[PDB]
Amino acid sequence: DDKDFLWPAPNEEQVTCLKMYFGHSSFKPVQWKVIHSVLEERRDNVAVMATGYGKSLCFQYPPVYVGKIGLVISPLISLMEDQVLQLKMSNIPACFLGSAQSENVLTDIKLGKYRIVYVTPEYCSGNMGLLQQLEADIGITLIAVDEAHCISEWGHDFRDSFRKLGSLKTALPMVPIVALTATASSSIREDIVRCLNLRNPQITCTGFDRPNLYLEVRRKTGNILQDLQPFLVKTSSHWEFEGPTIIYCPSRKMTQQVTGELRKLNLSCGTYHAGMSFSTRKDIHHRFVRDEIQCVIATIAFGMGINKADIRQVIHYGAPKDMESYYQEIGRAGRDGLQSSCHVLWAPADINLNRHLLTEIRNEKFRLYKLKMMAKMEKYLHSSRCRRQIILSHFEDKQVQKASLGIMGTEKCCDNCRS
Ligand SMILES: O=C(Cn1c2c(c(=O)n3nc(N4CCOCC4)nc13)C1(CCN(C(=O)Cc3nc4ccccc4o3)CC1)OC2)Nc1ccc(C(F)(F)F)cc1Cl
Ligand SMILES: [Zn+2]
Numbered sequence: 001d002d003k004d005f006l007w008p009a010p011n012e013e014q015v016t017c018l019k020m021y022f023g024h025s026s027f028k029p030v031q032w033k034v035i036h037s038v039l040e041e042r043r044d045n046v047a048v049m050a051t052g053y054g055k056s057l058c059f060q061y062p063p064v065y066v067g068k069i070g071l072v073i074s075p076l077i078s079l080m081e082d083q084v085l086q087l088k089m090s091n092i093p094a095c096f097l098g099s100a101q102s103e104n105v106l107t108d109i110k111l112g113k114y115r116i117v118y119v120t121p122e123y124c125s126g127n128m129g130l131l132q133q134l135e136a137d138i139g140i141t142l143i144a145v146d147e148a149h150c151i152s153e154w155g156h157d158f159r160d161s162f163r164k165l166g167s168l169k170t171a172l173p174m175v176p177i178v179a180l181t182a183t184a185s186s187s188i189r190e191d192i193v194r195c196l197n198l199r200n201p202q203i204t205c206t207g208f209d210r211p212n213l214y215l216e217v218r219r220k221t222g223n224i225l226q227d228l229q230p231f232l233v234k235t236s237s238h239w240e241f242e243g244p245t246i247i248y249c250p251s252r253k254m255t256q257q258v259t260g261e262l263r264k265l266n267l268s269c270g271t272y273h274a275g276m277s278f279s280t281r282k283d284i285h286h287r288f289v290r291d292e293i294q295c296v297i298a299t300i301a302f303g304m305g306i307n308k309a310d311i312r313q314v315i316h317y318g319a320p321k322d323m324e325s326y327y328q329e330i331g332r333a334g335r336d337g338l339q340s341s342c343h344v345l346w347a348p349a350d351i352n353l354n355r356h357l358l359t360e361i362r363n364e365k366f367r368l369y370k371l372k373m374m375a376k377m378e379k380y381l382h383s384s385r386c387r388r389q390i391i392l393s394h395f396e397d398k399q400v401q402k403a404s405l406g407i408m409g410t411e412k413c414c415d416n417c418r419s
Helices: 012-021 029-039 056-066 077-089 102-110 121-126 128-137 160-171 186-195 224-231 252-263 280-289 323-331 355-360 364-382 387-395 398-403
Strands: 045-049 069-073 094-097 116-119 140-145 177-181 202-206 213-219 233-235 238-240 245-248 269-272 295-298 313-317 340-346
Touching: 012 056, 029 045, 029 056, 029 140, 029 202, 029 387, 045 186, 056 069, 056 077, 056 116, 056 140, 056 177, 069 121, 077 094, 077 116, 094 102, 102 128, 116 121, 121 128, 121 160, 128 140, 128 160, 140 160, 160 186, 177 186, 213 387, 224 252, 224 313, 252 269, 252 295, 269 280, 313 323, 323 364, 323 387, 355 364, 364 387, 387 398
Parallel strands: 045 177, 045 202, 069 116, 069 140, 094 116, 140 177, 213 340, 245 295, 245 313, 269 295, 313 340
Antiparallel strands: 233 238
């Protein structure tokens, strides 16, 4: 069951609703992330998606489940017409709202007869008073802004119509905005978050097969220098990795240890852990971005703000917490699209493997969730199957494995695909 690997667990009516109106068994981790953060946290989202495969459910499902109203703001007229028809045929009442259509649909929208209203950014700019009325009389579950990259002057597909969608948060500060786009440009999403005036936005990135990441799992011995020696190359007196390198460790003690023995070879490296000031941390980034230091030995803490294109190696010195955290950590590697490697070095005596450590948690539901996650991360590490296939299976939809051409099976895919 996939529903086991979601936190919170989608309730029984949520599952019923998905099968009834969309015809699916379970939510994928990213879909659930976006949907739940909309419904329960009312949190602005930026959803990066390489295709429209599982893209619609993110903004269509929420207003259907609560039975209120969702607003999709898009310039893609014919794509909007196809989705309006698909919703109508799935017994979801939906319309295209524009100046031409207004006389037939507007009264019905105002009296709450539509779950999902598609509009152009042109039309939306004029009728902010209509939006405030709908918030007041029904309540708007969310506003989806598709092709959100069109708000950016520095993007490749700029649209004048998008300029005044900034006023949505001024007009509706309580209503969450789901900004959708097909570009993984870090500068454009900063334009999207800025121009749409988004607050503490959840960022997600799916539909990409990351063919330039090689995955390996490898038994850890005990001796640190023994374990890392394979990854090291000397140039004169000092030692160095082949490129920019991140070594995530499960404990704060380990980051100090690993950094300790890596220093003895005069390696250009530094720590980044929980128990320190958000001041020394600021420089380590700027050093690492400017290639002043080569390696960073960190915990789960380091990563969220990393925009470094040329990360060549990620190493998990010890089994990671779970697949969620692992997916995030490896996802930072090789953003430039050049060959990078992601190695796990694990032993059975790692703190994220012992089950009789989580028995301390007395909340039944949460304890069972953490055990399913530990079991599944364990199943991945011991696997003799394709590391990429396990990860795509769990995180991405079926059509990302199908669309994944000419990497799975090759000597650059994973240790299991090699031998
Ligand atoms: O790689 C991806 C998707 N993807 C992800 C991230 C990312 O950066 N990129 N970057 C890409 N590229 C797509 C292709 O073009 C280059 C960039 N893809 C992803 C992140 C996003 C979330 N994140 C955070 O720390 C939060 C956060 N980020 C922020 C950025 C700015 C500001 C605030 C932020 O807050 C961790 C990194 O995780 C997913 N999928 C994937 C596909 C196949 C395989 C396989 F090979 F194993 F099979 C493994 C994986 Cl992981
Ligand atoms: Zn493989």
